Amino acid sequence: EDPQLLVRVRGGQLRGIRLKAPGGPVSAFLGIPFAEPPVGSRRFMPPEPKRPWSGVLDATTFQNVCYQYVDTLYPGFEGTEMWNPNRELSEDCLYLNVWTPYPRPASPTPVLIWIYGGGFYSGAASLDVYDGRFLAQVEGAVLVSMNYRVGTFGFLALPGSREAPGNVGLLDQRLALQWVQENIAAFGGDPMSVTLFGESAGAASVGMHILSLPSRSLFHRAVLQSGTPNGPWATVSAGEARRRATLLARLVGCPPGGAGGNDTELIACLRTRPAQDLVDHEWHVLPQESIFRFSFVPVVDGDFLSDTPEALINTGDFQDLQVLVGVVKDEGSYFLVYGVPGFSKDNESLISRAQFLAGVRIGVPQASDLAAEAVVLHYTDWLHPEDPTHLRDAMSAVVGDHNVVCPVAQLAGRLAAQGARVYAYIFEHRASTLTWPLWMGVPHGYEIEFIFGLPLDPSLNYTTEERIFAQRLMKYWTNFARTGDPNDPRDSKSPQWPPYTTAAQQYVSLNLKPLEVRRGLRAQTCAFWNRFLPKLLSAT
C-alpha cells in the first residue's frame, strides 16, 4: 500500500495513482464521487451529498463524462474533437479529480479549482487540455476539477417548481467546492486559500459563484478566462427558461396530450425520457437564428442569482476579492464556422458585404434592425466597405466584442470600481500546433493548453519558446492563486503586471515577448456595446 496514494476523506477511503509528468511523478486521485448520482427521479434536481462508502474506492481512472451533445461539424478534425467527450456518457457523472505533487505535499498547498466550459452544453473535466498533472509537478499545486451537469440535465428549468428548480449544474459545482473545503486538507491542499479558475461557460460559472453568497463563502480568488456572468449568453430570464423547457417537453411528446401547466406532471413525463431524446432535441428550442447561444444556461431564479448578474456586479461590494480576467486575441472567430455563412476552416473565408450584414443579424441575434444598423456602421471601414478581408475580420470582431470582450471590459470596470483588485490580460499567442486555419488568429479556448502547461510534454511537439512561455503563464496563475497577485515577489524584472483600474485601465499582453502594458481594453468599441447599444435596442 502506498501511503501517498491512500486517502481517507469523509465518505471513506480511496486509492490514487502515481503518474509520470515530464519532470517527475505526481499523485492523481481521479473519479472521486461527490454526489449521489442524479439519475432517474433525481433528474433535473439539485445534487445530494455522496452517501459514505466502505472499502477503498478505486480512484485511479477518470469517471464518466456527463450526458451531452457531441460535436460533429468537422469530424476527424482535431480542432473540434479535442473538446469532445473522451469517456462514456452517463447521467451518473458527478465525480471529481485531484492532482497533487508526489509525495503528497507536506505543508497546506494553495488549491486551484477548475471549472470547464462548453456552452453549458458540452463538457468534461477529463479532456487532455484540462490535465492538472503539469501544474502539480511543476508549480507544486493541488489542482481540483469536477464534472458538472451540462445540457437539459444541468439546466432545464421550470422556475419555482420543486422538481426542476434550475441551475442544478451550478449546484453541482458548488457541492464540489464544499467537498474541497471539507476534504482537500487530506491531500495536502489548504482550504484557507482556494482559487477558482474557468473558461467560456466555466468563467461564467466562476462569475456566478462570486455573485451567489453561499458559493462566495467557499473560496477566495477568481480567474475568469474569456467569459463573464454578465453578457448576452450566460443567463436567461425565468420567463424564457420556462418557455424553453415547456417547448422541449412538447418536442419530445411530453405534454403528453397537450398540457404543461402542472409542472410536476411535466417534469415527471420528461424523466421518463431517454437521455439522448433530450439531447437530440435540446437545441431546437432556441428562439432565433444565432451563434454563441445555447438553449439551457444559468437562470435568473432569484435564488442562486438573487438578481440579474449585471445588477449584482453593479451593486455588490467586492473589497474582499481578487480577480484575474482576460480574453484571447480573436474571441469571435471560432464561432463563425458554426452558423455564419461564408466562413469555413478550409479556406480564407473571404466574404461579401451581404454575407457580412446577414452575419451581423446572426451574430447579434437579439438586435433590432436599428441596433444591427449601428453595429454595421461602427464595424465598417467606410473607405473600403467592400473589402472582403476587412469584412471577415470585422465579423470575427463583432462576435468577439459582443459576446466576450466587452463583457470582460464591463465586469473588470465594475469589479474594480466596487472594491475588488482586478488584473487583466490579453492572450496573443497562436500555438505552433494549432489545427485551425490562419484567418482565425488566436481563437477562443486556445490559451488553456498553455495555462495547464501542456507544452512541457515534449511528445506534444510545441517549440522551446512555447515551453518557456507555458512555464511563465503557470507561474503567473499560481502566483495569483497563492497570493491575489500574479507578479513575482522575489523579483522586479518582468516588468510588473499592474492592477486594472477605472482610472488607468491597464492590462498586459501575454505573448512570447516580455510583458507589455496596454491601456484601454477596446475602450471606445466597448463604450458602444455597453453604454449605447442598450439605450438603443431597448426604447425601440
Ligand X SMILES: *[C@@H]1O[C@H](CO)[C@@H](O)[C@H](O)[C@H]1NC(C)=O
Active site amino acids? 200, 331, 444
From the list 211-219, 291-299, 392-400, 428-436, the region that binds ligand TQV by CB under 6 A is 291-299
Which of ligand TQV, Cl ion, ligand X, none lies near 476, with the C-beta cut-off 5 to 8 A by kind? none
Give the chain's radius of gyration (CA, Å).
Answer: 23
From the list 115-123, 320-328, 433-441, 492-500, the region that binds Cl ion by CB under 5 A is 433-441
Query: Chain centroid to CA 60: how far?
Result: 26
Task: For residue 519, report the phi and psi dihedrals to the nearest 5 degrees.
Answer: -115, 150
From the list 40-48, 250-258, 292-300, 390-398, the region that binds ligand TQV by CB under 6 A is 292-300
- C-beta closer to ligand TQV: residue 118 or 365: 118
Where do runs of H (alpha helix) occur along 364-463? Answer: 369-379, 388-400, 406-417, 448-451
Comparing C-alpha atoms, which of 113, 316, 142, 305 is closest to residue 223? 113
Residues 309-328 that bind ligand TQV (CB under 6 A): none
Q: Is 265 in the site for ligand X (CB under 6 A)?
A: yes
Beta sheet of 56-58, edge-to-edge order: 6-8, 13-15, 56-58
Which of ligand TQV, ligand X, Cl ion, none lies near 114, with the C-beta cut-off 5 to 8 A by kind? none
Single out the residue of 4, 109, 173, 200 in contact with ligand TQV (rule: CB under 6 A): 200
CA–CA separation, 309 vs 203, rounded Å? 13
Comparing C-alpha atoms, which of 292, 165, 176, 320 is closest to residue 234? 292
Single out the residue of 264, 288, 389, 502 in contact with ligand X (rule: CB under 6 A): 264
From the list 177-185, 258-266, 314-322, 409-417, the region that binds ligand X by CB under 6 A is 258-266
Q: Is 117 in the site for ligand TQV (CB under 6 A)?
A: yes
- C-beta closer to ligand TQV: residue 298 or 445: 445
* Number of chain positions touching ligand X (CB under 6 A): 3
- C-beta closer to ligand TQV: residue 233 or 497: 233
CA–CA separation, 32 vs 133, rounded Å? 16
- C-beta closer to ligand X: residue 264 or 272: 264
* Number of chain positions touching ligand TQV (CB under 6 A): 13
Which of ligand X, Cl ion, ligand TQV, none lies near 441, with the C-beta cut-off 5 to 8 A by kind? Cl ion
Comparing C-alpha atoms, which of 297, 183, 168 is closest to residue 231? 297
Q: Is 525 in the site for ligand TQV (CB under 6 A)?
A: no
DSSP state of 360: H
- Tell me the residue number closest to ligand X, measured at CB: 262
- Measured on CA atoms in the order 377, 379, 380, 383, is the torsion positive or negative? positive
Residue with cell 487532455: 128
Whole-number Cα distances in Å, 264 to 38, 52, 260, 299:
17, 30, 9, 19
Helix (H) or strand (E) holding 198: strand 189-199
- C-beta closer to ligand TQV: residue 21 or 454: 454
Residues 412-471 that bind ligand TQV (CB under 6 A): 444-445
State the DSSP string of 431-442: -TT--S-GGG-S
Q: What x/- string results for residues 206 through 245 when contact with ligand X is judged by CB under 6 A?
A: ----------------------------------------
- 330 touches 400 (CB < 8 A): yes
Comparing C-alpha atoms, which of 313, 325, 318, 387 is closest to residue 356? 387
Q: CB of 421: closest distance to ligand TQV in angstroms?
A: 26
- 397 touches 529 (CB < 8 A): no
- C-beta closer to ligand TQV: residue 179 or 233: 233
Residue 363: all three cell numbers together:
451574430
Q: Is 233 in the site for ligand TQV (CB under 6 A)?
A: yes
Q: Is 293 in the site for ligand TQV (CB under 6 A)?
A: yes
Question: Which residues does a chain break follow in the chain (C to N more than 2.5 Å)?
Answer: none
Which of ligand X, ligand TQV, Cl ion, none lies near 444, with the C-beta cut-off 5 to 8 A by kind? ligand TQV
CA–CA separation, 521 vs 527, rounded Å? 10
Footprint of Cl ion on this chain (CB under 5 A)? 441
Footprint of ligand TQV on this chain (CB under 6 A)? 83, 117-119, 200-201, 233, 292-294, 334, 444-445
